[PDB]
């Protein structure tokens, strides 16, 4: 199961 | 024992023509589960074990859904890194990213990852307390301070201390027949003839899951790294792996020589004898 | 850009024995960038059926790659893995050994 939040952008 | 579940995330940005391949893969233990490529007809997260295939529909668009946004931020993470760094858009650059967590023998949280490499080097690391950040550079500096500013590692943690630890729960139970089985490795000792005074006796570990192993050579009771050679762990092909030690020893004396064998799938350790 | 040579093993899946079908595996490891071309021989030609592992990596970011085909051993064939990537001038050829 993936990350479903947003993620972070560098 | 203690379990994983890992996924990594690989775009690799092509200056040429077009977009970046990404490449992502998902794992329980030494088990792949799940691929996504780009480069692929099919533009969905696929299956890659038996197990998983259980899951209905709503779960693979789900995961369809979020491996694409996956994608579409390194891609970015590829522009703004190159212009961190000042590189120009000639070269073919590489973002790397891997998170996770692990469930310790009592079935509980145990440890959470969540880190990043640019070109193959160390870029921004999620700590073991889940709450700072271990940046390589100035770039990742840059990275860090948003990322303090806008309460990341509070929303990672959300994940690696829940949702995660649910879902490899699920995956191994639903996959118990293989993923809480472990096989011991197949072990066997074989002979080649160095000279008329010198021997190599080898030690083989076959069809064994998981990876972790250790061969060591012991000379009358005594460990013996002289001599040895050795192979990395290497995947069989099927899911199991293979590893071998050898030793070169004097014609006659490979009664002294004995090989010991350590897997979590052994109750006490083994024994060879030539 | 850091570059890291591939390191390489040839090998078969189930120990090697003639007219019984087998799997070639050349792994490459150890190896930074992604790009990377693996063809496996036969008696020096290259071989069509061949499947690969899909892309992962290690804990130190370097990535690893199986490169597969069913085979049958025989006493007269022989087996090699080529490999060509960045850090090498020319393709590199593993031979397959006995006891590799």
């Known amino acids: 199961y993936l990350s479903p939040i947003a993620s972070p952008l560098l | 024992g203690s379990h994983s579940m890992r996924y990594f995330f690989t775009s690799v940005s092509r200056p040429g023509r077009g977009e970046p391949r990404f490449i992502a893969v998902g794992y329980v233990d030494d088990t792949q589960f799940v691929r996504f490529d780009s480069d692929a007809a099919s533009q969905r997260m696929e299956p890659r074990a038996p197990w998983i295939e259980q899951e209905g529909p709503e779960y693979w668009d789900g995961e369809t859904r979020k491996v694409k946004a996956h994608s579409q931020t390194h891609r970015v993470d590829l522009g703004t890194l190159r212009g961190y760094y000042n590189q120009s858009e000639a070269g073919s650059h590489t973002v790397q990213r891997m998170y996770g967590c692990d469930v310790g023998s009592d079935w509980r949280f145990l440890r959470g990852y969540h880190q990043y490499a640019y070109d193959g080097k160390d870029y921004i690391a999620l700590k073991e307390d889940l709450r700072s950040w271990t940046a390589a550079?100035?770039?990742?500096?840059?990275?860090?301070?948003?990322?303090?500013?806008?309460?990341?590692?509070?929303?990672?943690?959300?994940?690696?201390?829940?949702?995660?630890?649910?879902?490899?729960?699920?995956?191994l139970?639903?996959?118990?027949?293989?993923?809480?089985?472990?096989?011991?490795?197949?072990?066997?000792?074989?002979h080649h003839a160095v000279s008329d005074h010198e021997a190599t006796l080898r030690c083989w570990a076959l069809s064994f899951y998981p990876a972790e192993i250790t061969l060591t050579w012991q000379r009358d009771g005594e460990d013996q790294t002289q001599d040895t050679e050795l192979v990395e762990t290497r995947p069989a092909g099927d899911?199991?792996?293979?590893?071998?030690?050898?030793?070169?020893?004097?014609?006659?004396?490979?009664?002294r020589y004995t090989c010991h064998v350590q897997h979590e799938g052994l109750p006490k350790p083994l024994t060879l004898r030539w | 850009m850091i570059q890291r040579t591939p390191k390489?093993?040839?090998?078969?899946?189930?120990?090697?024995?003639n007219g019984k079908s087998n799997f070639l595996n050349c792994y490459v490891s150890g190896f930074h960038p992604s790009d990377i071309e693996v063809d496996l021989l036969k008696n020096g030609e290259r071989i069509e059926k061949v499947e690969h592992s899909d892309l992962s990596f290690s804990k130190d970011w370097s990535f690893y790659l199986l490169y597969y085909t069913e085979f049958t051993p025989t006493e007269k064939d022989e087996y090699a893995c080529r490999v060509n990537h960045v850090t090498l001038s020319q393709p590199k050829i593993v031979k397959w050994d006995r006891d590799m």
């Open chain 2, 137 to 171: 550079d100035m770039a990742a500096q840059t990275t860090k301070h948003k990322w303090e500013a806008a309460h990341v590692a509070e929303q990672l943690r959300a994940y690696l201390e829940g949702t995660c630890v649910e879902w490899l729960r699920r995956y």
């Open chain 2, 173 to 190: 139970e639903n996959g118990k027949e293989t993923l809480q089985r472990t096989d011991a490795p197949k072990t066997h000792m074989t």
């Open chain 2, 239 to 255: 899911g199991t792996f293979q590893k071998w030690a050898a030793v070169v020893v004097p014609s006659g004396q490979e009664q």
């Open chain 3, 8 to 17: 390489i093993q040839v090998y078969s899946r189930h120990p090697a024995e």
